[PDB]
Amino acid sequence: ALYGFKW
Amino acid sequence: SGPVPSRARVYTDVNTHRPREYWDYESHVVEWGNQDDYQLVRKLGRGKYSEVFEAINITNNEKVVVKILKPVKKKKIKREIKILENLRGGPNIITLADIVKDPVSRTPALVFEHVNNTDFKQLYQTLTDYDIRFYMYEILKALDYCHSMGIMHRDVKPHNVMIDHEHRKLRLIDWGLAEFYHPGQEYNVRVASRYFKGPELLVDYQMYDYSLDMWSLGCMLASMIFRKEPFFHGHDNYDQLVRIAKVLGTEDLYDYIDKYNIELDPRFNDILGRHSRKRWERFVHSENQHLVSPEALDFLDKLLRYDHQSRLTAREAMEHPYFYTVVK
Ligand SMILES: Nc1ncnc2c1ncn2[C@@H]1O[C@H](COP(=O)(O)OP(=O)(O)O)[C@@H](O)[C@H]1O
Ligand SMILES: [Mg+2]
Ligand SMILES: [Mg+2]
Ligand code: NA
């Protein structure tokens, strides 16, 4: 995933 | 013609006597960390203008909280960032640990210290009289600090007060509605949740100050010690003032509007009515009596006043007899 983050 | 001007009794010129870079948040140059340090664990909140997650810092295996910022005006990104950086290290002020952005969308995200919060709707009913005094003192430390640094919070309420009860650890969060106090500045009254709005916001008095936070704190305290959530249950902004007048009475409302030469919106004419000033003891009941004391009622009486100037400052509040049993 979201907005360049990984889960 | 026009309202009488007002200024804060304390910390009036903190921003006046600081360099432009301290308060000119539109000129702030953000320092950005490495987004790839943080991985999202779970959603905590999703507003129209933010998405908040618990996350793991994979560089040190510590939990953090990521707040994705999507405000209507980008100016507001730098306001929240600059205020958090100005207040960083203050007692009970949430710590901004990092600021990152999506390399593709450029969506920005604040990275905060994690607090192991329990939802107030589960936690507050377990707190004792001492716990409420202890937590209220922690919030007052945060507010006297932020006021002393020239910042009004403007959104003090349970959802913006994180408590890790196991570690007796409180943080005042959510500085997205916070503003720099400049004496004489006319502010937007369309701020705060309806139940926590001060009378100055309800009657459209724009030249308010730090004292707005003290009214919000009073609303929070009243809801906790009386187990009445919310304490002032208005159905709309106009009704909100009527709910306050049913307690504080209409006489003192008119003294307030006349001291500041405030014109009451015509919408009040048919709903305001006439109300006596109530004794705070009328709100004591079997379910809340273990939380109430003469000191608690006197303290509440000294926060919940129409005239923002007459309310206790945070520092005056901290010296009140209600906190005599609290360390420092
Ligand atoms: N540091 C934190 N630790 C724990 N939970 C947090 C933290 N920061 C935010 N939260 C949670 O996310 C919610 C929204 O964060 P907040 O900064 O208030 O965003 P908004 O401005 O959209 O209200 C909070 O009400 C709280 O439940
Ligand atoms: Mg919030
Ligand atoms: Mg907010
Ligand atoms: Na600077």
Numbering used by the authors:
A (entry chain C): 432 to 438
B (entry chain B): 2 to 329
Sentences from the paper on this structure:
Before proceeding to the synthesis of constrained peptides, a series of linear peptides was synthesised based upon the central sequence of CAM7117 (RLYGFKWH) to determine which amino acids could be removed without compromising activity. Comparison of the linear peptides indicates a large drop off in binding with the removal of the Arg (P2versusP3) and Trp residues (P1versusP3), suggesting that they both contribute positively to the activity of the peptide, with the removal of Trp resulting in a more profound loss of activity. The Ile to Trp mutation in CAM7117 resulted in a boost in potency (Kd = 150 nM, Kd = 460 nM for P+ and the corresponding peptide bearing Ile instead of Trp). Therefore, it is unsurprising that removal of the Trp residue resulted in a large loss in activity. Conversely, the His does not appear to be crucial to the binding ability of the peptide and, therefore, it was removed in the design of cyclic peptides. Combining the results of the molecular modelling, crystal structures and the FP of the linear peptides, the design of cyclic peptides was based upon the shortened peptide sequence RLYGFK, with two flanking residues for cyclisation at either end.
